[PDB]
């Protein structure tokens, strides 16, 4: 019932839920995603903080805006793995914020929304790029 969706959700959900308190490809992809994504957050903290400030997330209504950003980016016909990893990395950065404001329950839905839009808009590109195996290869060593 859509293995690509299931796999994508497992990887993306595990990474985002890790900010709150099964196959070989999925495990390696999670390790790659965390390694690259945590690096992006570390190196781009000021930029990410400024983007988060613009979102001004203080309540449930504000979390709607974030799903709209994801839709907005992935609706762009331009696709590459850098964009995919960066958007997920920003999702994890926001997930940390959600934890600190006692909105942990928004994190799993955020991961689901990211996954939904990613797969709905980029399925063909993802498969052409060898899916999550391709992701692991692109960011390898």
């Amino acid at each position: 019932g859509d293995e690509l969706y299931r796999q994508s959700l497992e990887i993306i959900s595990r990474y985002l839920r890790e900010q709150a308190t099964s196959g070989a490809t999925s495990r390696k992809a999670l390790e790659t995603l965390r390694r690259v994504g945590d690096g992006v957050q570390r190196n781009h903290e000021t930029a990410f903080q400024g983007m988060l400030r613009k979102l001004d997330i203080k309540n449930e209504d504000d979390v709607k805006s974030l799903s709209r950003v994801m839709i907005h980016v992935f609706s762009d016909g331009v696709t590459n793995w850098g964009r995919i990893v960066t958007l997920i990395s920003f999702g994890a950065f926001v997930a940390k914020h959600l934890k600190t404001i006692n909105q942990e329950s928004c994190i799993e839905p955020l991961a689901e929304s990211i996954t939904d839009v990613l797969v709905r808009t980029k399925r063909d590109w993802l498969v052409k790029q060898r899916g999550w195996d391709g992701f692991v290869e692109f960011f390898h060593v």
């Binding site: 690259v36 992006v40 781009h44 930029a47 983007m51 613009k54 979102l55 950003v69 907005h72 980016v73 762009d76 331009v78 590459n80 793995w81 850098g82 964009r83 995919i84 990893v85 960066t86 958007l87 920003f90 692109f138 960011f139």
Partner: peptide, 20 residues
Amino acid sequence: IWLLQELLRLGDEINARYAR
């Protein structure tokens, strides 16, 4: 507009870094 565009641009810069 600036926010979406800045994220897209960062993603493209990260893409170029790892495509290298």
